[PDB]
Amino acid sequence: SHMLRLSAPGQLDDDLCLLGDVQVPVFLLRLGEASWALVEGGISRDAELVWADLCRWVADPSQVHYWLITHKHYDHCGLLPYLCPRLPNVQVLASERTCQAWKSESAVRVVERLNRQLLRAEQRLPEACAWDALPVRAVADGEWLELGPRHRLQVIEAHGHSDDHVVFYDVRRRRLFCGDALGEFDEAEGVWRPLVFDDMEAYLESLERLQRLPTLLQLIPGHGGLLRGRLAADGAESAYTECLRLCRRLLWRQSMGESLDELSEELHRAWGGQSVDFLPGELHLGSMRRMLEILSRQAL
Ligand SMILES: [Fe+3]
Ligand SMILES: [Fe+3]
Description:
The strands form three sheets. Strands 1-16-15-12-11-10-9 form a seven-stranded mixed beta sheet. Strands 2-3-4-5-6-7-8 form a seven-stranded mixed beta sheet. A two-stranded antiparallel sheet has the order 13-14. Helix content is 32%, strand content 24%. The protein is of the alpha+beta class. It has helices spanning 47-57, 80-83, 96-102, 105-116, 200-211, 230-233, 235-254, 260-271, 283-297; strands at residues 5-6, 10-13, 16-19, 26-32, 35-39, 64-68, 91-95, 136-139, 144-148, 151-157, 166-170, 175-179, 184-186, 191-193, 218-221, 226-228. It has one domain (1-300): Metallo-beta-lactamase, Chain A (4-Layer Sandwich). A hairpin with a 4-residue loop joins strand 11 (166-170) and strand 12. Bound molecules: fe (iii) ion (2 copies). It is classed as metal binding protein.
């Protein structure tokens, strides 16, 4: 494995564990002797796995006080209706737009449909809270979340991947939970693959701002584990570069008269393997096409 990427379940740092699968992780923060937080909301089918793992570390689940959520995509909030009823004291901390999504019928539909496609035959989901009944507190750009005596995290708006996306920055630890704002980390090659699914200008602007943070030591995206060393320090910059690279490739191909499909198909070939276990059906190819449409409009 690579020393700069921690990619195994369990303890990551003195205060930090990875619950569930490294591909769609839930992070556990130990806030004090009787207090914990979760970060990232996973996929619904992982409810019993994540619960099992949580209970190995947390003897009394009424001590889980906060659950921080980066964005509204199905793979970042799918666990909430299934595990919140088991976490009686939890407060879900999410952006205003992310909270709005959970009050939208159309929105909830897509999330439930995409999550149901990842169930296996033999599983029953736990009994769920209604999405509009989740124990939420909306949080604002720039807000400091005083989670515990040695855990103070700043909310930072990071739109572009989605129109609601935020990141959470722990400056004590130079630790950034960046969701999908940097893209998908390529485990084979050590580079970012852009995930521009809403707005390219916003995505790049977000990265520009994140580059201005004090140097990072730990960078924790939505998928793939914890990145450290140079990967953390250079991540926002590298992510920006890889986005420009993709834009340039797209223009090269379109200038030869190719349809957006030729590159979508190539990108689905080159990149779709890593996420096959949590992107159902045709979603990766369609996501590629979406992203290329966005880039094409905002830069052809
Ligand atoms: Fe996403
Ligand atoms: Fe994601």
